[PDB]
Design a protein around this ligand. Structure first.
Ligand SMILES: O=C1CN(S(=O)(=O)c2ccc3cc(Cl)ccc3c2)CCN1CC1(/C=N/O)CCN(c2ccncc2)CC1
Ligand SMILES: [Ca+2]
Lengths: 235, 51
């Protein structure tokens, strides 16, 4: 997360961090239920074996309120391709149930139509993670969040040096130095509605971090809703 | 009808059933009696900051 504020106690409970055997946090994730985690598919390429962590806000000050979980099954989207970042989604079925407490709660899955009509038409959304603070910088030790305005789909395609598919959408700023960054991949993008947050996008990619004239590219969750349900039945 | 008015005055999901509006809630909520509001069923409902 470049810019943005710090996730204050209880503000980003649906956050999840994928960690390698070296125990380093490399990607993000969203808590859907006690058994399922949502993430980017390209993230299942930045580590051999990895666990998923929840309830953490400071990767060094053992808040004692954290909890690590093992992955039983990784459900990667078949049509996912690295050469286009299309279908950049994935679902993780946990080995043990996540116990919900402070800083550990699930984000809501919205209805496909309502979402596109009332959620993505909202002025902004929230993206969060333990990713780099700057393009060249280092991974963050604290969990951050950033209000990123929804970007016009046309402005998006125009500013992009790559094909922005139907499975993606832009969010962020043209010039302001704020946007997700490395390590934030797979993390959550949520939209607020009457004090309830709904999942809307999976941190996918970008051309650099917070560069002038470039936006943040997220996976369009509403375009994979049904796929996600199917996965909740492990398929 | 008119879920485009003010979300139909629903707390969450809004659907227009030909005539009027039909509100619904995410998994883990139950529609209030006014057929609009959503109420949690457990202590950690999806979408709520835990404070
Ligand atoms: O420039 C980069 C930046 N990093 S990054 O680790 O800091 C990174 C990763 C995820 C991000 C998500 C958001 Cl919302 C915002 C910023 C991000 C920055 C990832 C890789 N690249 C190189 C790429 C080139 N951009 O300059 C990223 C996207 N590519 C395609 C190809 C065909 N179709 C679509 C996209 C190919 C390589
Ligand atoms: Ca900690």
């Amino acid at each position: 997360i470049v810019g943005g504020q710090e996730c204050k106690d209880g503000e980003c409970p649906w956050q999840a961090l994928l960690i390698n055997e070296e125990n380093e946090g490399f990607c993000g994730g969203t808590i859907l239920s006690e058994f399922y985690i949502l993430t980017a598919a390209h993230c299942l390429y930045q580590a051999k074996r990895f666990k998923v962590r929840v309830g953490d806000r400071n990767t060094e000050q053992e808040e004692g309120g954290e909890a690590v979980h093992e992955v039983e099954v990784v459900i990667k989207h078949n049509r996912f391709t690295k050469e286009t970042y299309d279908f950049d989604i994935a679902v993780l079925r946990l080995k043990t149930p996540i116990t919900f407490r402070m800083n550990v709660a699930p984000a809501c899955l919205p209805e496909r139509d309502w979402a596109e009509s009332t959620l993505m038409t909202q002025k902004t959304g929230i993206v969060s993670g333990f990713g780099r603070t700057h393009e060249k910088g280092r991974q963050s030790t604290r969990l951050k969040m950033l209000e990123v305005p929804y970007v016009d789909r046309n402005s998006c395609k125009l500013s992009s040096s790559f094909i922005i598919t139907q499975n993606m959408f832009c969010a962020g700023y043209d010039t302001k130095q704020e946007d997700a960054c490395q390590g934030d991949s797979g993390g959550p993008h949520v939209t607020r509605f009457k004090d309830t947050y709904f999942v809307t996008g999976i941190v996918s990619w970008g051309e650099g971090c917070a560069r002038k004239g470039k936006y943040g590219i997220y996976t369009k969750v509403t375009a994979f809703l049904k796929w996600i349900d199917r996965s909740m039945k492990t398929r | 009808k008119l879920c485009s008015l003010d979300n139909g005055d629903c707390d969450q999901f809004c659907h227009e059933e030909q005539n009027s509006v039909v509100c619904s809630c995410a998994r883990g909520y139950t529609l209030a009696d006014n057929g609009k509001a959503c109420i949690p069923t457990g202590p950690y409902p999806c979408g709520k900051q835990t404070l």
